[PDB]
């Protein structure tokens, strides 16, 4: 063993303070686990046809598989990570329908790129408003928040590939959307242009969200290219989070979930992975040392280069790791020394 005074002291018995292996499965207990299968969190939020089983569900940890794929209308979400983290921290997909007026337009649009049964469909939580008898009047719709809790609204804008398509769907070539509340406003203008085809569709959809406080009112003023919401999600606070892992779900008990299965949380340090959920030991770089409950955290792996923000995140996590490794080393040394001293 290692001590402050002597780097190599032989002792009769010793124990390992670093966990280096994993079970290989997620224990499914005591935390509530929701397996996403082929669905991502955003796809389950929007109402992808293959994710219809995730409606109104709740979770403590959301598991995203690398096999996940989208099978609906192509879309992109500005500030995707922020919305994903918000929904993951909320910890519920509970949905409540609201009766918006939407007078003078057609409702419940469907696309051939989104197949639910044998026919065309669309996102279950989104409403595609189009022309009615080749007319599209301006919409002035309101919805007040008379409840005691916050409301979350998900809406979208549609970007056609050509001007012909614009006219063919909205009967006019100039659309604009303004969604406002007493303390916020968001103005979005569609960008008509050609884009690479996904499932034969060159068009795209951009997703935006709005939060309404109790006593506030939501106002939507649009002239076209609007993907309306059908209701609101209840947004709360809790110990929920999201994790990317390909490990199978088992049937056991463990208060610490790692991407590589569940790990025992008896030892004070571990080196399996820096991504942890629940009551977990501290992560250190040391592979062997011889003698905390965080829930939602920051993202620690990135598949794309982004620059400043990602560099700062990496720097933060590196600093944490290095300081805790120093702490571990010093602690082990001190304890070994004091034990040697007290046994002589």
């Amino acid at each position: 063993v290692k001590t402050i005074t002597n780097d190599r002291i032989e002792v009769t018995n010793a124990t390992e303070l670093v966990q280096n292996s994993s079970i290989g499965e997620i224990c499914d207990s005591p935390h509530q686990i929701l397996d996403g299968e082929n669905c991502t969190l955003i796809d389950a939020l929007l109402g992808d046809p293959q994710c219809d089983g995730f409606q109104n569900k709740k979770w403590d940890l959301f598991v995203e598989r690398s096999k996940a794929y989208s099978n609906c209308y192509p879309y992109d979400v500005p500030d995707y990570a922020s919305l994903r983290s918000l929904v993951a921290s909320s910890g519920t997909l509970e949905f409540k329908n609201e009766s918006f007026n939407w007078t003078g337009v057609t409702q419940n649009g469907t696309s051939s790129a989104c197949i639910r049964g044998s026919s065309s469909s669309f996102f279950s939580r989104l409403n595609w408003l189009t022309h009615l008898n080749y007319t599209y009047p301006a919409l002035n719709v309101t919805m007040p928040n008379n409840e005691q809790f916050d409301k979350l609204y998900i809406w979208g804008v549609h970007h056609p590939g050509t001007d012909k398509d614009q006219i063919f769907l909205y009967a006019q070539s100039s659309g604009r959307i303004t969604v406002s509340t007493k303390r916020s406003q968001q103005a979005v203008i569609p960008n008509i242009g050609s884009r690479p085809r996904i499932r034969d569709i060159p068009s795209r959809i951009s997703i935006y969200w709005t939060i309404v406080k109790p006593g506030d009112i939501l106002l939507i003023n649009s002239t076209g290219n609007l993907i309306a919401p059908r209701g609101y999600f209840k947004i709360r606070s809790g110990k929920s989070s999201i994790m990317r892992s390909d490990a199978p779900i088992g049937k056991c008990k463990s208060e610490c979930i790692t991407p590589n299965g569940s790990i025992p949380n008896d030892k004070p340090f571990q080196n399996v992975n820096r991504i942890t959920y629940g009551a977990c030991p501290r992560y250190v770089k040391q592979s062997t040392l011889k003698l905390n409950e965080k829930f939602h955290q920051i993202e620690k792996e990135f598949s794309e280069v982004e620059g400043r923000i990602q560099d700062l995140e990496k720097y933060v996590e590196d600093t944490k790791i290095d300081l805790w490794s120093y702490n571990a080393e010093l602690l082990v040394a001190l304890e070994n020394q004091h034990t040697i001293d007290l046994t002589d």
Partner: antibody
Amino acid sequence: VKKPGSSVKVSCEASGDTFTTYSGINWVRQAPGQGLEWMGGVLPNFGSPNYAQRFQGRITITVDRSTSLVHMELTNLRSDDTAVYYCTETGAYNSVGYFPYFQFRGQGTLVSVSS
Amino acid sequence: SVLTQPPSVSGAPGQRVTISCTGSSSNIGADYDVHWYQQLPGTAPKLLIFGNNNRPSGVPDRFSGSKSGTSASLAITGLQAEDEADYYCQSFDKSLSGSFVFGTGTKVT
């Protein structure tokens, strides 16, 4: 010549130089020596087919996405159904009372019903 | 539902000739434009005018169109030999479930 009470199917190609993602296909009928009449239409990539009220129950419109075709079938034919059928593609233009115009592609198909 | 049109018109070549399409409060009168189609005998109908004044590429400027109130008018500045075809006017009817309405047709001579 089709026997009375039989079915007639007219196929059309939902592709071309001017065809886009959200272009539509409409069917037009013309009796010999008479005016033009409008039948059902469909957008191959959006919504469900529309139908004229005179033909309700007898007409069906199907979209074949593998061969990029659209077919219109008329069940329970009658002697007055002898006419020439045309495909039309929808055109777009900027206006305030805008409604799509019809672009006739190719020549019509002659269908005659007799016993 | 159909739009009223003169059965036929005639005149010598070289002068203006007018055709009219009269509508109701549901078509043309409900802020809807009118399209004009041309059909030479033994051929599929073609497109002549849309948007009440727009001419597609391949149509001479001799053809003009206008709309006023619940009526529309088609005009040809100079009659020629090739103007032997029939003309139809098309609008949209918002009544009931909505449909596309065509005129009764006209014959130019």
